[PDB]
Symmetry: D3
Subunit: 240 residues, 6 copies
Amino acid sequence: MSELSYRRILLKLSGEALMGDGDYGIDPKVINRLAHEVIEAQQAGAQVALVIGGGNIFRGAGLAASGMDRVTGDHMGMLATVINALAMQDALEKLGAKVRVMSAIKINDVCEDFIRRRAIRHLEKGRIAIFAAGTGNPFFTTDSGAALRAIEIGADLLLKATKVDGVYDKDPKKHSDAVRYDSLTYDEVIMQGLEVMDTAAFALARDSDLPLRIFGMSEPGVLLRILHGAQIGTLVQGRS
Amino acid sequence: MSELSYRRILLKLSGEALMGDGDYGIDPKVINRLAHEVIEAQQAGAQVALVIGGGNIFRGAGLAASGMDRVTGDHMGMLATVINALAMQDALEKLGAKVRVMSAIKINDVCEDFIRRRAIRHLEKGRIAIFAAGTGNPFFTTDSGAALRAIEIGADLLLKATKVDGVYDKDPKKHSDAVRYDSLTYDEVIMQGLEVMDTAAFALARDSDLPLRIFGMSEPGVLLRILHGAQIGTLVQGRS
Amino acid sequence: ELSYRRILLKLSGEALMGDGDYGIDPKVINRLAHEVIEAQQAGAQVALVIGGGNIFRGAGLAASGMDRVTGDHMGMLATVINALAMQDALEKLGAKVRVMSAIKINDVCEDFIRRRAIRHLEKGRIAIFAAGTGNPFFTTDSGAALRAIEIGADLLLKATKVDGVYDKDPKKHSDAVRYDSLTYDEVIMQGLEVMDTAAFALARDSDLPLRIFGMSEPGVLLRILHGAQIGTLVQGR
Amino acid sequence: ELSYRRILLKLSGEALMGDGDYGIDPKVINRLAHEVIEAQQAGAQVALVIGGGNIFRGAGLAASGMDRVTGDHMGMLATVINALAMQDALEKLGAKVRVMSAIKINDVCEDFIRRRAIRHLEKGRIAIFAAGTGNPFFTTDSGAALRAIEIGADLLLKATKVDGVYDKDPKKHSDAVRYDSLTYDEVIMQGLEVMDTAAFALARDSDLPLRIFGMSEPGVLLRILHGAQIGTLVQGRS
Amino acid sequence: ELSYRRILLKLSGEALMGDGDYGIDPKVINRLAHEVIEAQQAGAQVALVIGGGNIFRGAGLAASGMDRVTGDHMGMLATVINALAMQDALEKLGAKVRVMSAIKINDVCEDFIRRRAIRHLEKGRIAIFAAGTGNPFFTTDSGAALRAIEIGADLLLKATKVDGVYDKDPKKHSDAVRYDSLTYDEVIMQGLEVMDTAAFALARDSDLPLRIFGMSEPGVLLRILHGAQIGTLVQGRS
Amino acid sequence: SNAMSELSYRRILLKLSGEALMGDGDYGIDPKVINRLAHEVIEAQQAGAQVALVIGGGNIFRGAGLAASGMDRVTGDHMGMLATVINALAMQDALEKLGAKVRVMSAIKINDVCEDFIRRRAIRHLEKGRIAIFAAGTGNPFFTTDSGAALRAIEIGADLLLKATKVDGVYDKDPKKHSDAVRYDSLTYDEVIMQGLEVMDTAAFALARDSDLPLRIFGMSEPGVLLRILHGAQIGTLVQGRS
C-alpha cells in the first residue's frame, strides 16, 4: 500500500507565491521553504508535478504593459515561467531531489520538451516534474496549462494554491462572515457564479472530472496532510 | 553630414539600461527613447544590430542567487535577454521600424535562430536585427555574444553603452581628477590594467580587428553623431 | 467594398466527405476551393481550418477504448492530410497556398508563426491551418478561434449542417427561427450551443466576431463578405 | 529454440480494413496484436511496418491527377495513424511499444534513430516504424527493407494476399505451385514479382532473408519462429 | 535556344580533387564554378549534387569493414563540406546559391524543402543538395535522381570518367562503341551499367532523361543545354 | 584495470588535435593510430575513469582547397566543425569494436548522425560508464577546439582537462632551441600569464582560469601514459591554482 490518499498530484502556484515580501523576483527563504515542502511530499511516496506562474517576473509597467501586444505579452509570460522552473529545480536539487523540467515550447539545453509518455516515466521513477510555458499557446492561462498537464499525466489531484484557503461563500478579504465550502460540484460552481479558474481552464478540468483542491499553503506541513486525505481548503469534484 | 563614418554597427546595452529609475523590469519611457535613437541611426542609413543584456530581469537575491549553479544562472540570463528583445521589437515596430529577433537558442514563434546569411540580408533590407541569448553557451558573457555577432555580421564598429561615458584612468564618480581616454590600443587597455570587457570577449574583438567604442548614451542624437565620426567616449582600436 | 478584410473559415471535415462515407470527395472539394478563391479574388485574405472527422472515422480509428490523447493525435494527423488535399486543389486553380501546422512536419507543412502567417495573408496567399492547438483535449473550434485571434481576423466563420443558431431544433419541430445576431452573454444565458465552452470563452474574451452559417449554394461566402445576414452573427459584450 | 532472434514484420494498410473498405477493423487489428504479442512472448524481438492504403484511399485522397509528392506525403501520415492504432492495441494487452517515424512529428511519436531502435528491441519493446523512408517515390517495402537492414534483423516477413510466391496465379489457375525457396537471382530471372525493383535491390545487396507468406490462420508467426517452412523464403545468391 | 531549362548536374567528389590524393584542388573547383555560372547565365536553372569520395577516403575513414550506417553518415557529412566549398567558389564569382541538405544542420545548410527549392531555382539561384537521400545504404546517384524528380528537372546529367555509355572499356579499347541514345529497357537488356539498380529504377519510373557524359573540356555543359548530343542519352521505354 | 582506490582523477576530458590521428599520412585517419588511441582510452575507463573525448578536425579540414588561405573564416570554421563530427564517428566505431559503450554529442544538431549536446544527459552517460565524445566545439565560429574542450570540461565537472600535444609539457624556454630548457611540473594560472607561456589561446585559457579547471599538458609519447596520469603520475605539466 501507500500511506497517501493521493499518489500522483499536480500542484499549481502563482509566480508571486515565490515573491514573498518583495516586489519582484524570488525570495530565497520562500523558495527554499517550498522546496522542503515538496521534497517532504515525494519522500512520503507522492509522484509530484509542479506548475508555477510567472507574475513575479512578467510584471511592472514596462513588461506587463496594457499597451504591449497580447501574444508578445503571453510569450514574455511563458519565458518567465521557464525562469521560475529553473529556480525551483535548483532549489530542489540542492536538497538532493531528482527533478526534470519540461516546457511546452522547445528551448535547447535549458530544459526538455514536454512529452506525455516521458513525463509519466519521470514521475513513475520518482522524479519531480516541473512544467513551464503552460499550454505553449498565447491566450491561455497558467491554470489551463496546469489542468492540461494534470489530465495528461493522469493526476489524481490538481491542487491550486491561492491567497484564499478554499472557495468561499463570498470573498473573505471583504467579508468576515464568509463561509468556505468543504466540497463542491463543478456545476455548483457554475450555478452560483463562484470564481475558481478562468472559464476555459475550468471547462477543461470539468470535462475530465479532475479532482480540484483549492487551498492556502500558508503553513508548513499542509501538503502532506492533504495527501493523507485532510479536508483542507475546498474540493471541487463531480457533476450535479 | 550625410555620409557615415560607420555603415554596419552592432550596439550592445546592459539590461539595466532599460530599467530607468526602477529596480527591475522595463521603464516604458526608457525603452521608447532607446527605440527613437535606434530608428534615427537606421534612417541616417546605418545598418543596425542590437544586443541587450538581461540584468534588469535576472536580478535580486532569489534569481541571481549568489551561490546558484552557474549554468542555471546563465540560462536564466539568456531567457531574460529574449524577454528584453521582444520588448525592444515591440517598441521599434510601434514606431514604424522593421525588426527581426534572432537567438543563439531557437524558441518557436518567439524568435528565429541565428543564421549569419539571413542576418546580413535582413540588414541590407533595412531591418534592425536584435540578437538574444549570447553565444548560446554558459560561462560566456553578453559581451562575448556581442563581439561574436559583430564579427559574424561584419560590423564596422562595436559599440558598448555604459553608465560612464568612456574609459577613465581612475573613475569619475568617486574621484576628482579622473582622466578619460580618447583612444586606446587593445594592448594599452591591458597594460594599464583597465577594466573594459572580460578577457575572452576582449580577445575575440581584438583578434577580429573590431573597433570598439565605449561611451554613455547621455543625451539624444549621440548615436547619430558617432555614426558621423564624432569622438564621444573612448575608442579601442589597433594594437601595441 | 468589403465588410470583412481578413477572415478565417472553419469546416468540419465531413464537409469534405460529400455523399461518400469516407475520406474526401473530389467534386465537393473543387467546389469548396472554388468558393475560397472567389472570396480572395474579391480582395479578401483567407485562412482555413478544416477538421479531421472524414478520416479519423469508424470503430477501428475512432473507438472509446482508446487513449484519448492518441485519438487526438490521430485527429491532428488527419487534419494535415485534409490540408494537403485542399492545398493541392487550390493550387490546381492557380491559387497560392501556405499550410501551417501546430505540429511541424518537414517538407509537408510549415510551422505556425504569427508574423509569418500574417505576411502570407497580406501577399494574397491562402493560409491553411492544421493540427489545431497542438494539444489533446482541445477541439477544432478552439484551434480555429486561437488562430483567428492570432492573425487579427475580422471574422471567424463556422460552416455547419444547420445554417444559423437555433431557436428550437431544426430537424424535428417545424417552426423555428434563426436569430440574426446575438451577444456572447445572450448565448450563455439562453444556453444555446455555438462552440464548446473553452473555444467560446476564448472567442468572447477577444470579442472575435463569429458567424455561424451553412454553405449550401455557390456565392454564400462572397455575399457575406459584401455584407449580408446569412446564418447568425455572435458578437458584443 | 528460435530460428530468428530479431524480425521485421511488414503488413499492407488494407490488411487492417478487414471486411470494411477503409480505416481499421477492430477485430482484425486485435487478432494481429495477439499474434505479435505471442511472437514477442516467445522471445522474439519484434519490429513492424504497416502501410497506409487502408486510410490513404478513395478517389478524393488517392487520386490520379494529383501531385505524387503530396500523395506520398498523405500516405506517410496515414502510416503514422495506423502505427498509433496498433500501438494502443498492443498496449491494451500489456506490451511495451515504441513508435518511430522517418519524419519528425513531436509529441505524437519518436524520431527514428537506429541506435535507439536497436536499444529498444533489446529491452523487449516492440518497435513500430512509420513514414517509411521519409522520402517520396519510395515504397513501403523499401522502408521495411531499409529498417530491417538498419536494425540487423534476421528476417523480413512480408504478409500478402497469397501465401507465398507462385509459379502462377493460384486464384485463377489451380495447379499453380508455391516455391519453398528462391535465391535473389532466381527471382530476378523467373520474372517473379516480389517487391518493387528498388526495394528488392536494397534487400538483395544486404542478403536480407525474405519470408513471403499469408497470415490467414493463427499461430503462423510462432511456427515460423520455431522453423516451419511457411510461405516462400527468398535469400542467397544464385 | 535552350533545349533544357531546369537541370541537375551530378558529380563524384573525386571530380574536385584534380591530381591530388584528397580534398579539393582550387583550380579545378574554380573551373567547375565558371562552367556552372556559364549555364546559369544561359538561362538554365541549375541544381548540383556532388559526392564525398574526395574526403571520405583512406583505410581510416572509408574502412572497408566498418559499420555501414556509420560510413554512410561520414559520407553524407563529406558532401556537406564539398557543398560549402562549392558555394564559396560560386559566390566568389558573383553567383547566388543555396545549399540544402537531407540532414538539417543549423547555419550551415538548410533543410531540403521541395517548394522552397523550386522557388530558389526560379529566382536564379544555384541549388546545391547534400547528404543524398538522408538514408544509409543509398547511393549519391539515388539522391541525385530523387532530387531531380522532386524539383521537376528536365534533365539529370551524370558526369563520369568516360564520355558516355560504352560497349566496352574505351580506355583500353579504341574498338569501343559509344551509344548516342538508349532506352531504360535496352540498358537493362544489354546489361549496361549506368547507375546502381535502385537509383536507375527510381529514374526510370519517372522517365527522367539521363545524360551520361564526360566534363572533358570547357563549354560542354552549355553545348549540351543547346542540344548537342554529347555522351549518352538514356530515356524512354522498350 | 585497477582498483578505484588508485584513481587520482575520477572524471576527465582528453583533448587531441585532428592531426594526431593522421600519423605518417598527410590526410584523414591512420587506422593504426586510432586503434592505439582506443586502447589507451579503454584502459583509462577500465581503471574506473569517466572519460570524455574531444578531437579537432585539422586532419580532414586541410590542403589548399579546403583550408584556403583566403577564405571566409565562418565557412572554414563550419567545415572544421563537420570534420570533428567525422573523426568522432570513427572513434565511436573503433571504441565500440573493442566493447566500449559510447555516445557522440555535437554542439550542432545533426539528427540520426549523433546526439545533440545536453549537459545533464552527458553527465548521466558518464556516470553510466559510457565514453562521451564531443564534436563541433562550442557550436560557434571564431572559437578554438581548446575553447570547446574547456567549456565541455567545465560543463561536465571534469576533475582534469588533458591536452595532448607534440611537446610533453610546458617549458621555460623553447627546448629544441635551448638545450638548457626545463619542463615545469606544475604552474599556476597566474604564473603562466606572467611568464608569457603558451598553453591555449587567450579565450580558452580565461575560460579555464575562471573556473580553475585543472589542466594537464602532455605528450602521448608511449602507451600506458594516460593510465599513469590517472594514478597520479607527474607527467607533463599541471596548470592549476591561483597567484
